[model samples]
Target: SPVRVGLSVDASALGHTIPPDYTGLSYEQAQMANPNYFSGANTQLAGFLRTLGRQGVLRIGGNTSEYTFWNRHAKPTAADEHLAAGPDKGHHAAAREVITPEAVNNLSEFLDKTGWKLIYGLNLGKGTPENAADEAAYVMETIGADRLLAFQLGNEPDLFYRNGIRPASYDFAAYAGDWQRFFTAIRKRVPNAPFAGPDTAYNTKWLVPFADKFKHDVKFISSHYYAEGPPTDPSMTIERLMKPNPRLLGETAGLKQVEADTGLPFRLTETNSCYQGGKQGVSDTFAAALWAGDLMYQQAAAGSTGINFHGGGYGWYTPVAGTPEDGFIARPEYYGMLLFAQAGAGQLLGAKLTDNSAAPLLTAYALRGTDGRTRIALFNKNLDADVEVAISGVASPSGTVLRLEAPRADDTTDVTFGGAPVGASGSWSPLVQEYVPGGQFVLHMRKASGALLEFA
Candidate 1:
């Protein structure tokens, strides 16, 4: 039986922090101590969340998930206290701002209305037991005790010491001690709160020990990854976007093995192809969409409980973005998310590849519906090759073939089904043009494109 594939996103990516001296960027300024810019009326946060809900897990929070300025503290009356900055301040970059009760309450309201559960992270790096306890109390009170599935104490605290923020001697034991203290305090406030950790950014080594020591308190183990980082290398272009990295595969597989060994579900809490605000030409391009689609399927097949693509609205590296006047716009990754939402639901039926050496470049999964409909998703990562796909173990029926492609890999315009533009909201209209049906359907997938072939 194929597992139900889900999409995980970081909500904070939907908004960015605005500096006092506006840079003519497309985002709003911080209104309150804990601003709700992304959750506002014009933004696409709710719509995007709803879209992801149709497919899989929508894990809200990322690097911004920790050190959140969501909850409130005493308002900063002074200019120095009011204007905090970070390396990537666009709209939501005030990392150390005190999260207010009002902010947490607003977020809870939005989550309730949107019908999404949370895997919330707390500030472990610069936060105290009091801070954790207060946030925990707000979450429990506003979102209810049952709404939260897991509470992560920190995000990538291991990087703090490595990034020169702390002493090199800083160890997991010390971090774990701090986490335990925070956990104990939070548990006192919300006695039945479930937990998951060590939400380390890229340190797989810490997983075993953290799980071993806090297995009783931790519900699941979490980690993060980004295939390539820093300046975009020409060697790592769209042609090789879907090529599997042996190092990542081995490392993630090892983590899954640890999960098997420990009897806990493993989650790739944060992931994407490129990091540090994604490569301008690649990450925001259609190539990224194709890569994202394949990565989601592969992660599920590898026994990961969930995979969350980090970044939302702002930041140079996010998959989704916003316009100052028109509000949020779907980035290439957002289109990939839409493809997953439309086709990657239901039970994952067994699927295989034939005559495709570029297995990573071209991936497909069969999803069976209650009505005897099977949806086969084909991902084409090649920049120039059009893949012809064949399916077995199921009969093809008369159904619509929905394809999303562009003339070039770097194009970020609206996607077309057959030939017509897909509706941005509500039920999608029929294919703009007719599609042929066959047991073996050939997808005329352009280079760096993705298609969802559905048959009843």
Candidate 2:
């Protein structure tokens, strides 16, 4: 009947610079499927991304970055045809086939049409610096800086040593030399081209060392993170997934310090709940949304300027299901971003959370906006039991709430925000919104759910 919580927000404290496109997904370049998806011809796809936001990023790289090749000539196959992925991430030491100029040109048009920029990656694992430069120059000139965000030299280079693509002795110094060769070639061609880097997976220590040397030229430094192992691992339980995962936050634990020292933007460019394709229950259900929201708030609080959750087309942890006949289906994971894009805005203020009734299963956040309004996002991680919390500091005389929920943390379907689910037409009408103008209120938080509130 009675649960007490203390929450206060300092509008004066410095707020984290959450990018307008803070929510982004990383995809394999091989999955473009067809020009329709990349050229903005797919009305449904374009509409879906627009629904997310106008100013966002489409990171066109992944395991296919090293495998993706550019065609120097005109349409090789049918213009409507999809290019074979060719080498893929781990397969080809030297991918011989071409990806076609149509892919690049159409992508340029796609960026312009969608108002989205690109974090384009070039083949560094197998191709030469000259090869990377040639493709990058074409992309830069064709797409122009207006549509381009930055060029990613490689994908998870730290794994290169273990993957047998590089020598076991490959360290920062050696990586620096190899990276410089690529940059030097790119500069000679594009002149002061923007780039993002060291794109590591497990070797996060590489970020500071690499940044220390190339911070001047780097636009943003990035690394990948995964909370757990391959989906097949039996240890990845819903309860385990619900448990505080230290690995997710471990990689970038010191990123804020590095950003402070180098003055360079850093991000967890690639991350998902579980690696090597996520678990069906853990990565693709309501629990994932809770986990993701928790992850976003923690990272933002820790001072990460940006983040890009990895997955699309390959489908393990894809936010958007697939480019359907209608072009997109907003999956449960997509709601995770929707939840953030709508409420996780402005400066992250400190909030105190306590559960006297039982063990705590909630993550709380206070976001103070420039418009003099404070928005709070509350996450309930418990699988069962409804709890009520008494609101305290920053509680306004009046408030309105937007709720995010699914049947259960393990449910893959029936997830909703407010009253309605994310629509096929790219519109979301809240299912339940309550407006209460009063002195004190109790938030009736259901199990496996989250809520966003706007109060003075």
Candidate 3:
């Protein structure tokens, strides 16, 4: 039996738009050491990001943010000058890393060139509140208010104790104490400093209480998630990456209550395929592309304000990989973002999938575009079988379909969208689009693949 997806125009009338800057990338605070890395001077990187959408967020923070120091006059510090970073032990720096005025100025221009906003993090683990305030003030003055989104006080504070940033006795209450001090100092200087916190790693326990106390002070609540972990784990396979994640479902379900209680927006500021840097074969392959595209739609439909996939350098999961010196290339995960970008800014239509077959792993999402087109995305994550889906209540059956697939789930190079790969220079245009005709038609969803359907 084909999976049946039911849609109602009336039900979708209450759908909400997935904000202008809903898609974004997250990088470590230490990546700024190379001033040109995130600067407008690097046209390739800027161009690559532009392919995602006109508006998005550039989140600068990771474990390294805890050790980052701001020095307007001194030379910047190297990322490996002192290091104690890894997946299991957590990403931390032994010696402090410095970010300077040049980097800040360049970042401003980069944001201008790419048309994206910034969600910068302060050094809460090792630096003083005064220093954080100074850095925040300079960022606001340099980037201007229009390009700045909100300041993330810290990165993954929930894991501070285990990562050696705080004592074992530390908890949300202790974090709140530190957060208040930084908030006060930064607010004192910037006056209208926009803020978002407590950027917890895996803990949702801190969300509601933090929002309840500081909801009036923050633009949104933030958290992080990784479907799997440390490449060292033998269980972290492609199958695991594609399967339904109970933890993620539970986390998002709990967040609904946070919004219900405080009415503050929620955003996943840091996320990726795997926890520490990403798994080798899984995170870097076509599997990540399907997983990422599905994750974006899942979060957006769950009421998330935005999501930033964490990556940088030559990491296995960096969406837009390579550096300014070497030029940049869109990774498989980047294609997932490109697929979502094709949806544009639109209202998410209500879609219900009815399938009673065993091993049912197909997922679907629909969006009504401002162009008066209804766009539907179908993802078949099943590893061994293809599923057929019948969609109804769309405006028409005559539409284009962009297939998101690869030679194999583990194949990294053969991935393509609409039968073409994104050019090295960030250029991409759909080709050889395939479609079917009918008021209610059957869509053949291949195993470990996905597709986007647009109907006028």
Candidate 4:
């Protein structure tokens, strides 16, 4: 069967409440609660959730969610509201303050209808132990204990340490101790709460020790990723983005090793193409989506329990907007997710790279369906060439093929299906190309593109 692939959204990052000074209307105002905000009849948020259900995991809560104050007593303090603009931009600001109860309720309702389990994070940065406990308790009460699959302690304490407020001396040992303390406190209220931990951003050092020490308490180990760093060089093109680098693969292997040593499942809880919000051009483009699709297969093959793409709107590096109606716009990365979801349930079979020279620019994974069909997912990261693929394992089967490609990787035009030159225009369009087979299927993947070939 196909392994579960998940997407991450920061509910707190949704642009519900925009300040009066801000030019854009806030998504929060459009909901039923605000008189100024008028939510249309559109079920955009619910629809997005359904789309995600066809995928695998949906991890809510991000950096903003960690400091989210839902309970009345846990409201943000003066210090919490102030923004220092350094590393604190990831923290809460005064005007951004709001209770998470409504957001949680809204999300819970959507998840209940969509049949998606949640991996929720709590605020450990600005929150007190009581606040975290209360939020956890409220989540359990509102969503029901059975709905949630895991509870994350914080978003990225490693980043917090770098910010100075968390203390430069703070390390995984401190974090593990703190996690145990928090877990013990929450366990008192919700005894059966399953937990995932060290939701660190680019920090794997915490995994083994945290898991080894808290093996009985921790259910899974979590981490985050971003492909490249600042000073975007032209040499860092889509071609380089196509292949999995040794360092990155090694980092993933390191996490799996931690799992092996500790017997805990591993999760890439929050990640994207570029960090610090995302590369201005790269992260939001179709190129990034192709990168994501290939990365998902790579992680699954390497024994990752789940992977969630982090996204939001109006933040440093938000992918999708949070508003129910207008806020749910799918970006370039969204198309990547869509292609992955449509691939269907199956076990990854095997694939051979046809062109060795273009090895970094091309990648493929075979998925064996339950109905005895084979689905092949091919990715072409070369921003210019149209690569052709041939199938090996199965006899000819009839099915549909979908492609997510645009004039350019960064183009937001609807993803194109069927081999028409340009991309589609809307989310509901028929983006798949159906093929009559002669035992062999050929895929014409565009530059910086991804395709799913399903035979049923």
Candidate 5:
């Protein structure tokens, strides 16, 4: 096949550092989650997460974080978001919403066994600052601070106004004022405890003042993103997901600026392809797999620390599709994180992807690992067809290609990485292709898919 696109990397021009836990997930609060998610009893599930990122963070949070009712020994509420507007003003997800101390005990055990870190979110919406502090204190004590990366105080506190939880005029000043009390309380119990916050929905600008207020305490700036939302957008389809949107990266320029000022890292704590669980065909399909891989590289290229792709049983876009009768059946998207877990390892080398602006379906990145090898990260997000990627200056003629594929972008099954499916046990060993030397090696990429090429 004649090369259709060319990619080059300037090894001397280095970029950002890839955190060991860069590839991680943002699971819904316990309210919408199964108890076994953190019970550490599911050995098969744990093995699956380990395969994604050995040191990745597993953040427990979402809108339901605000309604979590937990007491060491008190009876818990299933789904309660009332007590105002004549006893039932607004609503929330309907599930047994509780985070019992027993749950915390199991979580600690899970973290101990997985060797992964945590970014725990405290409910600060309908709860008191003291309530948040105690939750923070108990979890840290139970799990040990070593496993906790940072504590997120709330989930999208900025949206409190829209959800009728806060005053309509709510702003950064007001929200931070309430957050300060929560911050003060948590710090009192766990003095010098690190925090990652300003978990905002559209309040990206609020992060600056929030970080400014807690400059001494801030660990990573947290936010969320979605190209569009509500899952009802009839226009949002697999082809829509495959389309290029540079604004995706443009939107984070401000967060990047905050990182520059505070010397702290940034992470999109809760994000996915779409807003409300994601459009079934767009988010659940193989197209999302390609979208996810590109999104991670874009965040890394923008010099961010990490991005926690949001999901769980409740989220249709969830990488772990569902808890079937047997166990976790991973969706195609899980392979995307695995792609990043492998390619975004070591250090990010300085590289630029040059292609036709008229057709930006192809996105690429490069990483020079500590192993003294270079990895070429390539993604093809197109509606229909394939592209032959002509490579130059990769420094090695022979290497192995780690490929991920599906029947098509909209395929719901038969998605495989390295020519092997992530089985019910959550295991995948990609098919390795060893290529001989050739001038300007060319690679074929199916529409709405991607792979990483490694050279020694």
Candidate 6:
């Protein structure tokens, strides 16, 4: 007898409304290596972004945002064209890199092409409040007001001391003071400019107090997360990625608590599998697809309004890697984004899974989309042994299963969903369809794979 997986779904109840812009990618300000890197002419990059979700967010910030300088009258030069190729040692560059208005103009065109919004990060570490205001003002004018999301004041200000951006004695109080100065200046320039903050690195302790003080002044609270770190550790392997992260649960709970206190929804402005540019095999493999897909459901289940997987030009963890000149292709994690996008704009429903066997690691999530279909996503994270999932609780048991799979757990390429690869132009369609009849049915979930059962 197979393990009976009983699922109880409340169709009438909606847990949380997953916004249309729920899918997003975070890139460093330096990724705009050339003004044209994020320009309209970069159709391939725009194509990949559009494929993830028609409407998503492109978060422009990272460590490089702290060193980004805006030059209104500057012209593009050979050095500016290869800005992303700068040394990754000690701040990626010794000095601030200037961004001309041409970049913003091109970025506007790129946003138009992808139908994505921007959460622009301002340089606070080495920039003046007046300069930030001027930059924000120019960005607002060039990018169009409606197309922009919110202006992020800084990137991971809590780590400013360690990074030498601020003195060791500097703390949240000092950050608040800095934030207020930027906030006041930007607001004076663009009176209705929307803002989100305490964009800290790992410290959730700063979230509550920041929210407590700036509750009336901002749009929402924001932060970042990394499942593991440094990339130099040999122990951070694919198997480790498959295991449950207790810290993530605690962080979400803490985020939920702040929401409970301030009524402001929290968004993970930047997050990914491993920190410090990602571990090669672990973050770039098929395992990242499974891990990221599971993370999306977990965060969405825990009431995260949005999440931006951090990556950019030629990084191991980038969902859509490469530039237009080099060509862009979907990484394993992009398939996770594709799966979520296919789930569509919907309300998450309560889904409970009970299994009799303990041979494999499995997780389930249910979403009722606006199209009136129930999508139950099943993840079988075990390294071996396929699991038979007997699904229950749906209006009709007949539906199609779209499998998200790859050659192996550690395999880097050849990952697919619905039996097709995302094309170079960011096009993908399901070639194979497995349908279940309208009765009691069981899904044979392969080891180290995911399936989304969409009920008609």
- Among the numbered candidates, top TM-score falls to 6
The positional error of residue 186 in candidate 4, measured at the CA in angstroms, is: 1.0
Model 3 misplacement above 4 A = 1-13, 76-95, 202-205, 229-234
What lDDT tens digits, residue by residue, belong to model 3 across residues 10-44?
Answer: 33445667898999988888766667777879798
Alpha-carbon local distance difference test for all models? 0.58, 0.71, 0.81, 0.58, 0.73, 0.82
Candidate 1 runs further than 4 Å off: 1-34, 38-43, 55-61, 64-95, 201-204, 229-235, 323-326, 358-360, 417-430, 439-443
Which of candidates 5 and 6 is the stronger one according to lDDT?
A: 6
- Per-residue alpha-carbon lDDT of model 1 for 1-456, expressed as tens digits? 111222211222222111111100111112223334323342355555565544233344444444444444554344422332211222333344455665556666656655656677676766678777877777778778656767887766676664444478778888888888999998888888888887754355577788778878878888777777434454456666667677678767777776777777777776776665466676777777777767766666566666677664454345445432444555666566567666644456566665665433666766664354666677777664665554445555565667767778776665543454433432244455546445344444555667776775
Segments in model 4 whose C-alpha atoms lie over 4 Å from true places:
1-42, 73-96, 201-204, 230-239, 314-319, 325-327, 397-399, 418-432, 436-439
Q: Give the worst 10-residue stretch by lDDT in candidate 3.
A: 80-89
Q: What CA RMSD would you report for each candidate?
A: 8.7, 3.1, 3.0, 9.6, 4.3, 2.3
- Reference-based TM-score, model 1: 0.82
* Candidate 2 global TM-score: 0.90
Clashes of 2: 7
Q: Which stretches of model 6 miss by more than 4 angstroms?
A: 1-4, 83-95, 201-204, 229-234, 356-360
Write one digit per residue (lDDT tens) for candidate 2, span 20-39: 66666677766543555566
Best by lDDT: 6
Judging by TM-score, tell me the better candidate of 1 and 3.
Answer: 3
lDDT of 1: 0.58
What lDDT score goes with residue 111 in model 4? 58
Poorest 10 consecutive residues of model 4 by lDDT? 21-30
Q: Least accurate stretch of 10 residues (summed lDDT) in model 6?
A: 85-94
Candidate 6, residues 1-456, lDDT tens digits: the string is 344456566676678878898889888886554886898898898988888888899988877888778877787788777655311233333356787888888999999999999999998888999999998999899887898889998888877776788899888889889999999999999998989887764354577789999998988888788888444644678888887887778878888888899988888899888776787898899989998988988888888888899887667888988765678789998998888888887888877667635634678888888888888887788777577776666878478999999979988899999999999868889999899554455788778899888987
TM-score of each: 0.82, 0.90, 0.93, 0.80, 0.91, 0.95
Sorted by TM-score (best first), the order is: 6, 3, 5, 2, 1, 4
Model 3, residue 362: C-alpha shift (Å): 1.0
